[PDB]
């Protein structure tokens, strides 16, 4: 998970051309939580809104259900 | 084990000293002597008050040096109120933000500010003397109880004389408490209070003792004080109706209860406290023997029933202290869902950062005292509960159909789990699938709440008709179109009810009946199971009974209490985050100069909140924000915190998820690196029981859970309110 | 007299050290804040 | 029942607190006539203040008042105190020998009639309490102001 | 004041003096309704001069309000 | 050397086991006990002594100033050598606490008056803190009015 973290944002910040954001907010945990985290769910978890429905409901929908099951273990 | 002497022996495994703190008021278990045990208990509850009371002095002290409640008070709408001053350390100043008045300090929620005006306080020096008389209190209670246990100890005689304590208590205290308090209301209270709503300036308003010396100047305002014979022994009693009303509603400059109705109603609260004061049998005749009624009462159904009650609740505390447990943790609850209705404070509603925290505070301790209440009614299962000498019959019977209790109790929950969370299933899966005509919505298939809006209906109309005393309404949630507006803030508004509120009403009914389900079980299937004929010898608080049988673990009634307390937590915590919606979504924002009111969330509470995405994003992920971006702010510590819950949240994961074994194992390992360089402690370390990591487990879990939202909730009022 | 001392000699005992240890760290700390390095 | 004691005991139940009684039978007696005494010597022919102020004649007050009322207690708790010419071999209820001069005389009971002159000089004392204060007017004034309109 | 005063002071008085009537009950000796009304009503009955002007300004109190 | 006859401070009674007027001094004064232990009264002993001793000579500074009705390097060197010279003095003295009927007398008057002078040494202080005067004159100065 660690892994996998550190891989994804360090490059979506580098395809978005902006190595900066990384550099400084991945020396303290809030910055990955919320420039990682919170920053990068606001498009998943507006797959489907109570005002239209997008190609990412599949994924908002997913997103949700792994919520469910995991919490069920 | 200081306590006993063969638990104080010796230490010889680090496991003695986690029972020494785990036992330590386990009172019961140190002696058989039911005398012993009530002294002892007495006691300690004189060893309580001490520390509320001085808790309360340094709550009247701060507020008094290190507060700037002055400057609150001439200027309540835009002054945040704030106690407690941190000093110049490591960088820790930056916790003292901008709460006007030209001080620094943090700003507060627990509501002091807005007693101490009702109060009619007006100085520090005010505050500086009921400080003191707090902690002359707290001398007082402390001595008392070293007094009483080494000095003059009651006998047990003097506890069972249950009929003399029940008169007092509910008229001693609470009769004569709610007169002398309605006393200080009208001579204090009332007269201060309408000097400051006419914008007087504090230092400006007369000194208290001024007021009941001479009428004259309590007079001129409610000029029914004018008679010094006074209208009371004429017993017109009309007259009087100046200075107490029964006018209800709320105050439109103020945002507060009158307390032209709190005095009235402390007036009524406290004779009615004093007449029902006098019904148990005492000494001189006149009165009841609550043994004796006890026993009248029986039936086709139960047979023999409430005999030998009297007998139980006089030789048992784990029995009464269930009972009470059970109520004063229900009691707490309906003054949490009392004081938002209907504030009693002035400027408390206008104040949302602390109505937030104090209907979430209230809703924690209420639920938290509840559970307790299921584990001393499953001790005294164990420990107290004798057919041969004390037989009651209810008891029986309940025991009888057990199995039929919990099977129907268990039917409920899955029908009310389908019932409640399906439906957001539903309404998610439709609504991803692009087809929300479909789902349970006010706009497509809707399921209106006509009930609870038929009651609110008539609650507006009664006014008038069904009460014609009453001017206005009860509370401004029933008005219809009444709309307080204390400064830009709005106080309070009629409160809509839809299908969104369909919805949520019956997720607390389930997680209300699970909750129940689980800590009801473990009381009654306390001493025997089909599974354990005799888990009562077991005791109330043991890990298991072996794998046998297919696996035994968490048979126990305190591992009942365990289950429940996750549940507990589940329970509240989406009740608190249904006040905080719904109040910021339909009720909270900003009125204009037109009349124009604005939402803090916009009532996107109605189509939202009938979506599990919909509260992940447009609550979670949106009134995040403020914590999550508190860095470098005067709300710094809330981000911290809520970082720091966060972690001993998922650090009880490790204790809940594992078993001793493992651990035990570990250490030995680490015990050889030990002995290899001379460092092995001569008392053996051992891993936690198997109960105590159960213990440990829950704990940091609600602490983790808990803190959590505290963050959330007290970061997202402050910044937005 | 011998019972208080042995009073202050259990976990308490801890508590007093912490609290000694404490002071000294946060008055160290007064006298030197902001330290990153040790540049003697 | 108020009376019955049973006790240890801390005292609410045994003997004493009726034991103190009895000597308030005596100051609420001297303390009376002691206060009329500059109400009505002053018939023929609120702060207030005297001389510096009277909390430091307090410290004086309940200093050799102290020194004194001390001691007493002492010969209760234990017959003998002895530090001075001091005798007190009375017994602890009373100790008439040596601070009376030349009477001894105490059976008739009188004591029964001190105690009699005690607890109503308690409600006279007792009088000028409650008298004075939620009226606004010394005990003097509404008494004769009583008996002038009684209805 | 006057006469009027002591006419509602005797009445305020007297409003404990019905619920004398309730339990006045007589039948002294014969018939019970006395010695009924002092086995379960009266454990005396100045305890009810006393329970008179307690429930009574209620009594006057509610007979104006129902 | 035991005597039940000590001028106890408090009268009838005051019999506390460890003090019994063995040592010069015993007015049988200790509720707190502050010494129940013999390592722990012997210790309070040579403590309450030097003490005394010190604050007497500290009144020997109150008998200055009625005379009349600080340094060359002030501090600094003036303490380091106090330091370095007490020290070697109470050094010893240290060394030796842990290795006539006539006597008693002296050492029983000795510790009383030695007992003033810490109560006086102090009051003069308190008296002088919070309250700017200097008690040089108050004897007679202050009994003039209360
Ligand atoms: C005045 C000083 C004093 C002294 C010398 C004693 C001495 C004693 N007491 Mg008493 N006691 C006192 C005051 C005192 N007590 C007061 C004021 C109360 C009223 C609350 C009591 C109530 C009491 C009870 C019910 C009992 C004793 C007992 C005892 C005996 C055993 C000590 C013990 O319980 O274990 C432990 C010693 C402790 C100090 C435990 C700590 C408890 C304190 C109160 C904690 C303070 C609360 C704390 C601030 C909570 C916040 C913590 C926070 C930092 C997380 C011992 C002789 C026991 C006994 O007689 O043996 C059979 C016993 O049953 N005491
Ligand atoms: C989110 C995870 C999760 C879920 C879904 C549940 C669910 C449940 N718990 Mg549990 N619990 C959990 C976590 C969870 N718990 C945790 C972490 C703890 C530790 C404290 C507990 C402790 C606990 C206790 C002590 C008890 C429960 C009980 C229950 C049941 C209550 C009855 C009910 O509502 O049935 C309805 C079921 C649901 C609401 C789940 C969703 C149903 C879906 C949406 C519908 C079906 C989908 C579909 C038809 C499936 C077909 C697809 C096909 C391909 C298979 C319910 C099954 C109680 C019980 O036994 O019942 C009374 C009980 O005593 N729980
Ligand atoms: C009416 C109030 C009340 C009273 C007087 C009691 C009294 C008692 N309880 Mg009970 N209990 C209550 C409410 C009450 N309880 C409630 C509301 C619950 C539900 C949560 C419980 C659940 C409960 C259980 C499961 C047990 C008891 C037990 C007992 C008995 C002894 C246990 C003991 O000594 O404590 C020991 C104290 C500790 C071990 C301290 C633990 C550390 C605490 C929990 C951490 C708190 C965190 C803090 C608030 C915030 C963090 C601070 C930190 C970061 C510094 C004693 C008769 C035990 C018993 O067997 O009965 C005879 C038992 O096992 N209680
Ligand atoms: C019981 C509840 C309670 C709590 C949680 C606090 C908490 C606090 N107090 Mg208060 N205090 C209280 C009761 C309480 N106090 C009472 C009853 C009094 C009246 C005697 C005071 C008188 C008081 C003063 C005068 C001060 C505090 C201060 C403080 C703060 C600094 C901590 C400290 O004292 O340093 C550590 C404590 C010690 C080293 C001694 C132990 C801290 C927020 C200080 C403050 O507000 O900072 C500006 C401060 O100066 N308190
Ligand atoms: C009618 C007067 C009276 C009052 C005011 C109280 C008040 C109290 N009682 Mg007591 N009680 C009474 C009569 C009274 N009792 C009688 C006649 C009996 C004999 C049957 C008892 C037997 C009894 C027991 C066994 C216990 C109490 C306890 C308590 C405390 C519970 C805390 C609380 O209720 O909230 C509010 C608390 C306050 C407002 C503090 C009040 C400050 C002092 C105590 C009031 C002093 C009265 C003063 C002269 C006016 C509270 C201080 C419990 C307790 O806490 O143990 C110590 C307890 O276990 N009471
Ligand atoms: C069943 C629901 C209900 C409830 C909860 C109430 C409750 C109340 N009524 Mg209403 N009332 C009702 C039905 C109800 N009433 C109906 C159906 C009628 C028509 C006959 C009335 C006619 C009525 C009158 C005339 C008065 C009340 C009054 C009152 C208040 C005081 C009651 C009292 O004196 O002592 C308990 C109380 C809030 C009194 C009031 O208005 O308070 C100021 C009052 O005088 N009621
Ligand atoms: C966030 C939750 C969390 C945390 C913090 C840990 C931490 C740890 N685990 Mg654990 N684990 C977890 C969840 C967690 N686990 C879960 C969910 C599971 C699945 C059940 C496991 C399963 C597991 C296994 C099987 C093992 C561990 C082990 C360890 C230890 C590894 C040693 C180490 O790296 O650093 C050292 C310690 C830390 C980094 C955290 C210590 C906490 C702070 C830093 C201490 C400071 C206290 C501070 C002063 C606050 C005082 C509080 C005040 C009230 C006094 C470490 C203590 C292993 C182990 O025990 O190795 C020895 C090991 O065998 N874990
Ligand atoms: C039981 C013991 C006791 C005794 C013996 C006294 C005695 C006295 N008290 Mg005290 N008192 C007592 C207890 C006692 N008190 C207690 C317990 C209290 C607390 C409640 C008080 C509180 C108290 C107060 C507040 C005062 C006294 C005063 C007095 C004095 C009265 C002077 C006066 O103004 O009135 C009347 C006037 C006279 C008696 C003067 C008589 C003058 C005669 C008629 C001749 C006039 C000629 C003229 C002097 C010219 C000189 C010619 C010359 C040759 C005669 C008197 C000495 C007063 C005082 O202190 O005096 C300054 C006073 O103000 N007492
Ligand atoms: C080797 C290092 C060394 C050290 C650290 C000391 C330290 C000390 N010596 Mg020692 N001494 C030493 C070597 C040492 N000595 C040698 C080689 C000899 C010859 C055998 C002595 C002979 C000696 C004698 C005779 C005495 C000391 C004494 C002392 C103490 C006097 C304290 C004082 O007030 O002075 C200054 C205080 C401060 C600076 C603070 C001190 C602890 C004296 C003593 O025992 O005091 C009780 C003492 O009388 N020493
Ligand atoms: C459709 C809308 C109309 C509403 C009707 C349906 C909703 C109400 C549910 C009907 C329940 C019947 C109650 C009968 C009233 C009642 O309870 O009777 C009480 C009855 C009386 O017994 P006795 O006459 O002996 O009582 C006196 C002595 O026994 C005690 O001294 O005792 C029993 O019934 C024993 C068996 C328990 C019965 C268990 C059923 C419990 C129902 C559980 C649901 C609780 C709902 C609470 C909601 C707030």
Same mark, same amino acid.
């Given at each position: 998970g660690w892994v996998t973290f550190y891989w994804h944002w360090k490059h979506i910040t580098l395809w978005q051309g902006n190595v900066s954001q990384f550099n400084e907010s991945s020396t303290y945990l809030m910055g990955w939580l919320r420039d990682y985290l919170w920053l990068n769910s606001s498009q998943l978890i507006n797959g489907y809104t109570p005002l239209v429905c997008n190609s990412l409901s599949v994924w908002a929908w997913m997103f949700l259900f792994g919520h469910l099951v995991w919490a069920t273990g | 084990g200081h306590f006993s002497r063969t638990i104080a022996?010796?230490?010889?495994?680090?496991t003695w000293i986690w029972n020494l703190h785990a036992?330590?008021?386990?009172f019961d278990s140190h002696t058989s002597d039911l005398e012993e045990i009530s002294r002892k208990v007495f006691s300690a509850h004189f060893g309580q008050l001490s520390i509320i009371f001085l808790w309360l002095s340094g709550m009247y002290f701060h507020g008094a040096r290190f507060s700037n409640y002055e400057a609150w008070l001439?200027?309540?709408?835009?002054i945040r109120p704030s106690a407690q001053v941190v000093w110049p350390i490591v960088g820790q100043e930056?916790?003292?933000?901008?709460?006007?008045?030209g001080f620094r300090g943090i700003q507060i929620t627990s509501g002091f500010f807005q007693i101490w005006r009702a109060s009619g306080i007006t100085s520090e020096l005010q505050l500086y003397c009921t400080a003191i008389g707090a902690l002359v209190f707290a001398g007082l209670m402390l001595f008392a109880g070293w007094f009483h246990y080494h000095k003059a100890a009651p006998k047990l005689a003097w506890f069972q004389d249950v009929e003399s304590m029940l008169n007092h208590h509910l008229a001693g205290l609470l009769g004569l408490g709610s007169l002398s308090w309605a006393r200080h209301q009208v001579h204090v209270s009332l007269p201060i209070n309408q000097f400051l709503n006419a914008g007087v300036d504090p230092k400006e308003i007369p000194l208290p003792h001024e007021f009941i010396l001479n009428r004259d100047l309590l007079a001129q305002?409610?000029?029914?004080?004018?008679?010094?014979?006074?209208?009371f022994f004429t017993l017109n009693?009309?007259?009087?109706?100046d200075f107490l009303?029964?006018?209800?509603?709320?105050?439109?400059?103020?945002?507060?209860?009158?307390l032209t109705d709190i005095a009235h109603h402390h007036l009524a609260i406290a004779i009615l406290f004093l007449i029902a004061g006098h019904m148990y049998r005492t000494?001189?005749?006149?009165?009841?023997?609550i043994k004796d009624i006890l026993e009248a009462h029986k039936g086709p159904?139960?047979?023999?029933?409430?005999?030998g009650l009297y007998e139980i609740l006089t030789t048992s505390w784990h029995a009464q202290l269930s009972i009470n447990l059970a109520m004063l943790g229900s009691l707490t609850i309906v003054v949490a869902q009392h004081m938002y209705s209907?504030?009693?404070?002035?400027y408390l509603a206008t104040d949302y950062a602390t109505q937030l925290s104090l209907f979430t505070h209230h809703m924690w301790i209420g639920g938290f005292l509840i559970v307790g209440a299921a584990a001393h009614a499953a001790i005294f299962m164990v420990r107290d509960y004798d057919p041969t000498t004390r037989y009651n019959d209810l008891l029986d019977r309940v025991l009888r159909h057990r199995d039929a209790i919990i099977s129907h109790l268990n039917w409920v929950c899955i029908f009310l789990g389908f019932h409640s969370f399906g439906l957001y299933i539903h309404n998610d899966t439709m609504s991803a699938l692009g087809?929300?005509?479909?789902?349970?919505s006010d706009t497509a298939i809707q399921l209106q709440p006509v009930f609870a809006q038929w009651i609110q209906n008539t609650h507006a109309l009664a006014?008038?008709?069904?009460?014609?005393?009453?001017?206005?309404?009860?509370?401004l949630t029933w008005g219809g179109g009444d709309l307080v507006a204390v400064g830009n803030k709005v106080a309070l508004l009629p409160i809509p009810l839809g299908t969104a509120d369909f919805l949520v009403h019956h997720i607390h009914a389930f997680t209300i009946h699970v909750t129940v389900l689980i800590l009801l079980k473990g009381v009654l299937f306390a001493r025997s199971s089909?599974?354990?004929? *005799?888990?009562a010898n077991l005791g109330?608080?043991?890990?298991?009974?072996?794998?046998g049988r297919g696996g035994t673990c968490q048979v126990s009634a305190w591992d009942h209490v365990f289950l429940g307390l996750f549940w507990m937590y589940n329970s509240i915590s989406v009740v608190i985050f249904h006040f905080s919606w719904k109040m910021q979504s339909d009720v909270w924002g900003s009125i204009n100069d037109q009349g124009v009111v604005t939402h803090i969330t916009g009532g996107?509470?109605?189509?939202?909140?009938?979506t599990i995405n919909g509260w992940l994003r447009d609550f979670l992920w949106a009134q995040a924000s403020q914590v999550i971006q508190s860095?470098?702010?005067?709300?710094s510590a809330y981000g911290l915190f809520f970082l720091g819950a966060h972690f001993v949240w998922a650090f009880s994961l490790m204790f809940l998820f594992s078993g001793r074994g493992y651990w035990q194992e570990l250490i030995e390992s680490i015990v050889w690196a030990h002995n290899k360089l001379k460092?092995?402690?001569?008392t053996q370390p051992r891993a936690l029981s198997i109960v105590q990591g159960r213990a440990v487990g829950v704990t940091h879990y609600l602490l983790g859970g808990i803190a959590t939202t505290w963050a959330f909730f007290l970061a997202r009022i402050i910044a937005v309110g | 007299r011998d019972l208080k001392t042995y009073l202050s000699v259990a976990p308490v005992a801890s508590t007093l050290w912490f609290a000694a240890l404490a002071g000294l760290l946060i008055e160290i700390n007064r006298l030197?804040?902001?330290?990153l390095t040790f540049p003697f | 029942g108020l009376s019955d004691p049973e006790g240890?005991?801390?005292?609410?139940?045994?003997?004493?607190?009726a034991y103190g009684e009895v000597i308030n039978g005596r100051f609420a007696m001297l303390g009376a006539v002691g206060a009329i005494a500059p109400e009505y010597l002053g018939k023929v022919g609120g702060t207030y203040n005297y001389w510096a102020d009277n909390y430091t004649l307090f410290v004086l007050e309940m200093a050799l008042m102290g020194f004194a009322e001390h001691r007493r207690f002492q010969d209760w708790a234990k017959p003998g105190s002895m530090g001075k010419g001091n005798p007190a071999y009375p017994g602890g209820p009373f100790?008439?020998?040596?601070?009376?001069?030349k009477d001894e005389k105490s059976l008739k009971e009188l004591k029964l009639k001190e105690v009699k002159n005690g607890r109503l000089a308690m409600l006279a004392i007792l009088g000028y309490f409650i008298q004075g204060l939620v009226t606004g007017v010394g005990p003097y004034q509404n008494l004769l102001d009583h008996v002038a309109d009684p209805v | 004041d006057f006469i009027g005063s002591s006419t509602n002071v005797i009445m305020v008085a007297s409003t404990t003096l019905m619920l004398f009537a309730?339990?006045?009950?007589?039948?002294?000796?014969?018939?019970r309704k006395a010695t009924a009304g002092l086995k379960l009503?009266?454990?005396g009955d100045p305890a009810g001069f006393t329970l008179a002007d307690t429930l009574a300004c209620g009594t006057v109190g509610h007979i104006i309000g129902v | 050397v035991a005597e039940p006859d000590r001028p106890l401070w408090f009268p009838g009674s005051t019999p506390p086991?460890?003090?019994?007027?063995?040592?010069?001094? *015993?007015?049988?004064?200790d509720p707190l006990g502050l010494?129940? *232990?013999p390592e722990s009264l012997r210790w309070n002993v040579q403590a309450e002594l030097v003490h005394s001793r010190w604050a007497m000579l500290g009144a020997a500074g109150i008998f200055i100033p009625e005379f009349l009705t600080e340094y060359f390097t002030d501090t600094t060197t003036l303490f380091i050598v106090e330091l370095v010279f007490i020290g070697w003095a109470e050094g010893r003295r240290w060394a030796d606490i842990l290795?006539?009927?006539?006597?008693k007398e002296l050492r029983t008057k000795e510790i009383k008056n030695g007992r003033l002078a810490m109560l006086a040494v102090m009051g003069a202080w308190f008296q002088h803190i919070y309250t700017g005067?200097?008690?040089?004159?108050?004897?007679?100065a202050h009994l003039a009015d209360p």
């Open positions: - | 022996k010796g230490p010889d495994t680090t036992d330590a008021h386990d001439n200027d309540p709408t835009h930056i916790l003292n933000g901008d709460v006007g008045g305002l409610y000029p029914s004080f004018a008679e010094g014979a006074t209208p009693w009309s007259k009087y109706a009303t029964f006018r209800g509603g709320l105050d439109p400059l103020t945002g507060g209860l009158w000494n001189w005749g006149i009165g009841h023997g159904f139960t047979g023999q029933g409430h005999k209907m504030p009693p404070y002035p087809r929300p005509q479909d789902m349970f006014p008038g008709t069904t009460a014609p005393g009453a001017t206005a309404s009860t509370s089909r599974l354990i004929p *005799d888990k109330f608080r043991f890990p298991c009974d072996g794998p996107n509470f109605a189509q939202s909140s009938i860095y470098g702010s005067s709300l460092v092995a402690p001569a | 030197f804040p902001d330290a | 240890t005991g801390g005292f609410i139940e045994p003997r004493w607190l100790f008439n020998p040596l601070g009376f001069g | 309730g339990r006045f009950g007589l039948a002294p000796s014969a018939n009503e009266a454990r | 086991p460890w003090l019994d007027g063995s040592l010069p001094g *015993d007015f049988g004064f010494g129940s *232990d290795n006539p009927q006539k006597l005067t200097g008690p040089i004159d108050n004897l007679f």
